[PDB]
Design an enzyme around this catalytic site. Structure first.
Site, short mmCIF file in Angstrom:
data_model
loop_
_atom_site.label_atom_id
_atom_site.label_comp_id
_atom_site.label_asym_id
_atom_site.label_seq_id
_atom_site.Cartn_x
_atom_site.Cartn_y
_atom_site.Cartn_z
N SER A 1 33.44 47.55 46.72
CA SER A 1 34.15 47.97 47.65
C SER A 1 33.66 49.20 48.62
CB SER A 1 35.51 48.64 47.03
OG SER A 1 36.40 48.88 47.78
N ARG B 1 36.88 42.09 34.38
CA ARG B 1 37.86 43.17 33.98
C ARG B 1 37.89 43.77 32.83
NH1 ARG B 1 40.87 44.04 37.75
NH2 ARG B 1 40.91 41.62 38.43
N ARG C 1 29.54 43.17 36.64
CA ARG C 1 29.87 41.75 37.61
C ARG C 1 28.51 41.31 38.14
NH1 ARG C 1 35.54 42.27 40.71
NH2 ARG C 1 36.94 43.20 38.77
N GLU D 1 34.93 40.15 44.01
CA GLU D 1 34.39 41.33 44.69
C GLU D 1 33.29 41.90 43.69
OE1 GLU D 1 36.61 45.39 44.67
OE2 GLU D 1 36.85 44.51 46.86
N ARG E 1 38.57 52.38 32.64
CA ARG E 1 39.86 52.28 33.66
C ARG E 1 41.06 51.56 32.48
NH1 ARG E 1 38.34 50.52 39.75
NH2 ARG E 1 36.86 51.89 39.79
N1 LIG Z 1 37.92 47.00 35.04
C1 LIG Z 1 36.79 46.69 35.92
N2 LIG Z 1 36.02 46.09 35.03
C2 LIG Z 1 34.66 45.65 35.93
N3 LIG Z 1 34.50 45.84 36.97
C3 LIG Z 1 35.34 46.34 37.41
C4 LIG Z 1 36.54 47.13 37.11
N4 LIG Z 1 37.23 47.66 38.19
C5 LIG Z 1 36.54 47.56 39.11
N5 LIG Z 1 35.46 46.81 39.03
C6 LIG Z 1 34.22 46.68 39.94
O1 LIG Z 1 33.89 48.00 40.31
C7 LIG Z 1 33.81 47.58 41.91
C8 LIG Z 1 34.42 49.15 42.39
O2 LIG Z 1 35.36 49.42 42.19
S1 LIG Z 1 36.64 49.84 43.25
O3 LIG Z 1 37.75 50.52 42.61
O4 LIG Z 1 36.95 48.55 43.95
N6 LIG Z 1 35.85 50.96 43.94
C9 LIG Z 1 35.63 52.10 43.81
O5 LIG Z 1 35.70 52.50 42.40
C10 LIG Z 1 34.64 52.96 44.60
N7 LIG Z 1 34.48 54.47 44.14
C11 LIG Z 1 33.54 52.19 45.06
O6 LIG Z 1 32.69 51.91 44.13
C12 LIG Z 1 34.59 46.65 42.12
O7 LIG Z 1 34.36 45.98 43.62
C13 LIG Z 1 34.60 45.55 41.01
O8 LIG Z 1 33.10 45.09 41.19
#
Ligand SMILES: Nc1ncnc2c1ncn2[C@@H]1O[C@H](COS(=O)(=O)NC(=O)[C@@H](N)CO)[C@@H](O)[C@H]1O
Ligand SMILES: Nc1ncnc2c1ncn2[C@@H]1O[C@H](COS(=O)(=O)NC(=O)[C@@H](N)CO)[C@@H](O)[C@H]1O
Lengths: 428, 427
Positions: B358, B283, B394, B355, B268
């Site tokens: 999700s 993050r 996480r 979180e 991301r």
């Molecule tokens: N950049 C990031 N770095 C670390 N953990 C992250 C990051 N972005 C999201 N997450 C973790 O990934 C989980 C799911 O990401 S989400 O965008 O919320 N949802 C999804 O991607 C859905 N596909 C369900 O998994 C979040 O709840 C968080 O725990």
């Protein structure tokens, strides 16, 4: 990079060894640049001594109440001459470095001379290729039967040279990576690492992907919020991030060897492969691999090569997979290798052995690019680096599927993988 | 994408629902394009009737021996007008689809109305945050002490928001992923998948990353030998490749539900995150996540959301990690969700919950984009759901901080010991 002292003091002997690899080093072009660099280095030192003396003369003339304008004119002249000589020396050193970065490693003396794969030499074999009493199926056919290898799905999601694995076959692919990491970290002395799968340009120069092999990689576009610092590439092997963990460091020799392993996806453009290995998992844009890397004192790298190659062979032996060990010839080696063993595993449907690991001694070639050094109990020297597959997971899955297939299409799970597959005895 | 029948024929009712999630539908712009479309469709019909009539007149005049030249020119002019009408209609239909692809999903009726994350509603909570008899260390400090989390090495290899994990901490991170996959495949009925980590543009449109969220992804440059077919992006979640496995299919309802899981790295850009979670693993540009995806019949998706969220809660319960389950309000939901639960885990060093998963019901929004249907007869769009079970990085933060000891050692959670060669403590 090669030792610049070997390039300056024995350029002709270096060119001769490089010719055995099919590389033509232009000794006379490099020699002319080296001569110009020596002249410019002497000139910069002379200008600096002369400028420093004239600056001391200004101080004295000023204190004596003398006119300092003629001296100020000279000091200004000399400063500009020094700026011109420094700009020329920096341009020359850059030109020399650009040539130096294109030169492959020098092969070890025991590497047999040869032009291609037909000149490689078998040094040992283990196990007996299974004699089947039914018509063998390849891994693609077996994977379709069990709905476990889906190439069409991967074309829809992405494109050619990708795969979607499902169910028991995906579980077996996972079990292979877990068995490999556990064996190396519990029995072979490697420390496990989780690494970035994207790396920067300094890292790619460190391990030799740059400058010559950018086309072999996938590159990511810079991120808008990291516009000047995110020109990244996907890793083609964990050798790249692992070896670079020692970049820019001085390590105490008593803290060597450093032995690292990682399981990562590996991304390769596979340029120049039109129509090469189009069947199944053999040549993919994305494949998993459990890599071994060693950072060692220079005296210990040939010994470490044998140890690391044995660590890869143990994976094959425990999986009951027949193989052959080949020493690559001068003409078939990777850019940075000075000595390589390949392990080739038996693939029943192809009726041949296919490469499942490359194990190399890189000597001080990457250490020089990375300035990775070691200190003795106080002068420093470059370390040696080694890397070896233990093993490529996708190709190991091909070998397990094809060597353990049964007449009805089921696949016996190798004994060592059963504890990683919840006791499963057969796929299907 | 929303049902085009709803956008065309009850736009103001759709706008009313979208405004509750903070999105202003431009009903006037869409209505003007839809009218131009209906007018052009009629114009094409007028022109085709005229062309067929004048062509019929040529045959009659040819049989009679009359001059057919003026009628031939008229038929050609009508052909040209039909060509122009069709081109304008195709351009308009593309413009309408382009707008339709920017519209978020309609929230389910039970989703609480709210503006932002402060209007989210707690549903339940499990466990009790640990009380410490020493000063809590954060995961970064714990990771330095055990030479297990090395952020400076990752900056050297790559850049900010990456990490290198080593030794026992790297093994713990791996054990978490293996425990999660084994739980979902052996106890929760999910089928394991190995997927591509690069995907094409059709896949990104299928799950909703495109057209609006290209800036959230890493994109790879096309390969010289696949110049027109290798505009790829790294996956931000396994939801993207897994959900697209049913793209373009008609599935027998007796073959539903389809339950898939995968463990993948996730990439991301984290654009817009200036100075948010600068320290640590919360993050990152690259993180591992064990994803759950369900493909279900339309009548079963709300029950499937409760089941899947329960699957993710089970990972936290088995790891002994206190958490809360929150339902996101309308204004805090992601683009494609119609209903989302946020599982948030206790993070001792932050004195709050963060979180960790999700879980969403996407209704028929991705199924429409992918044309993923089911047959009971007539076909209808399936529903899709996705949920983290869990984000591995996480989860590692939560295990390291919740299981830390006074001396900096970390107790290995009981369920992970079989995946760590029986190791009892990190250190
Ligand atoms: N950049 C990031 N770095 C670390 N953990 C992250 C990051 N972005 C999201 N997450 C973790 O990934 C989980 C799911 O990401 S989400 O965008 O919320 N949802 C999804 O991607 C859905 N596909 C369900 O998994 C979040 O709840 C968080 O725990
Ligand atoms: N494109 C590919 N698809 C599948 N497997 C591949 C591909 N390229 C290489 N491999 C496998 O990965 C192994 C190691 O690759 S290598 O390029 O020879 N060597 C390295 O990368 C070194 N870092 C040692 O691992 C090969 O022996 C082969 O088994």
């Amino acid at each position: 990079m090669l030792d610049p002292n070997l390039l300056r003091n024995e350029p002709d002997a270096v060119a001769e060894k490089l010719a055995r690899r099919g590389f033509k080093l232009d000794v006379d072009k490099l020699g002319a640049l080296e001569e110009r660099r020596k002249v410019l280095q002497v000139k910069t030192e002379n200008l600096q001594a002369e400028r420093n003396s004239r600056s001391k003369s200004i101080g004295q003339a000023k204190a004596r109440g003398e006119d300092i304008e003629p001296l100020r004119l000279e000091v200004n002249k000399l400063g500009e001459e020094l700026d011109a000589a420094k700009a020329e020396l920096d341009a020359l050193q850059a030109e020399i470095r650009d040539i130096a970065l294109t030169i492959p490693n020098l092969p070890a003396d025991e590497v047999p001379v040869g032009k291609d794969e037909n000149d490689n030499v078998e040094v040992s074999r283990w196990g007996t290729p299974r004699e089947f009493d039914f018509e063998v199926r390849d891994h693609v056919t077996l994977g379709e039967m069990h709905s476990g290898l889906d190439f069409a799905a991967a074309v829809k999601l992405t494109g050619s040279r990708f795969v979607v694995m499902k169910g028991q076959i995906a579980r077996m692919h996972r079990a292979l990576s877990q068995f490999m990491l556990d064996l190396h970290t519990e029995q072979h002395g490697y420390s496990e690492n989780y690494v970035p799968y994207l790396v920067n340009q300094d890292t790619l120069y460190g391990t030799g992907q740059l400058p010559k092999f950018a086309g072999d990689l996938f590159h990511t576009r810079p991120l808008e919020e990291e516009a000047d610092t995110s020109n990244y590439a996907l890793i083609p092997t964990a050798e790249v991030p692992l070896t670079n963990l020692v970049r820019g460091e001085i390590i105490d020799e008593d803290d060597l060897p450093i032995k690292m392993t990682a399981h990562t996806p590996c991304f390769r453009s596979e340029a120049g492969s039109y129509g090469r290995d189009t069947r199944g998992l053999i040549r993919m844009h994305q494949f998993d691999k459990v890599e071994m890397v060693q950072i060692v004192r220079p005296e210990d790298s040939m010994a470490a090569l044998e140890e690391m190659t044995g660590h890869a062979e143990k994976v094959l032996q425990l999986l009951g997979l027949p193989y052959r060990k080949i020493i690559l010839c001068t003409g078939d080696m990777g850019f940075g290798a000075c000595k390589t063993y390949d392990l080739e595993v038996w693939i029943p449907a192809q009726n041949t052995y296919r490469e499942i690991s490359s194990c190399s001694n890189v000597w001080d070639f990457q250490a020089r690019r990375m300035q990775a050094r070691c200190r003795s109990k106080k002068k420093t020297r470059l370390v040696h680096t080694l890397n070896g597959s233990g093993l490529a997971v996708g190709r190991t899955l091909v070998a397990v599927m094809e060597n353990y297939q049964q007449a009805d299409g089921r696949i016996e799970v190798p004994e060592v993988l059963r504890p990683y597959m919840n006791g499963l005895e057969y796929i299907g």
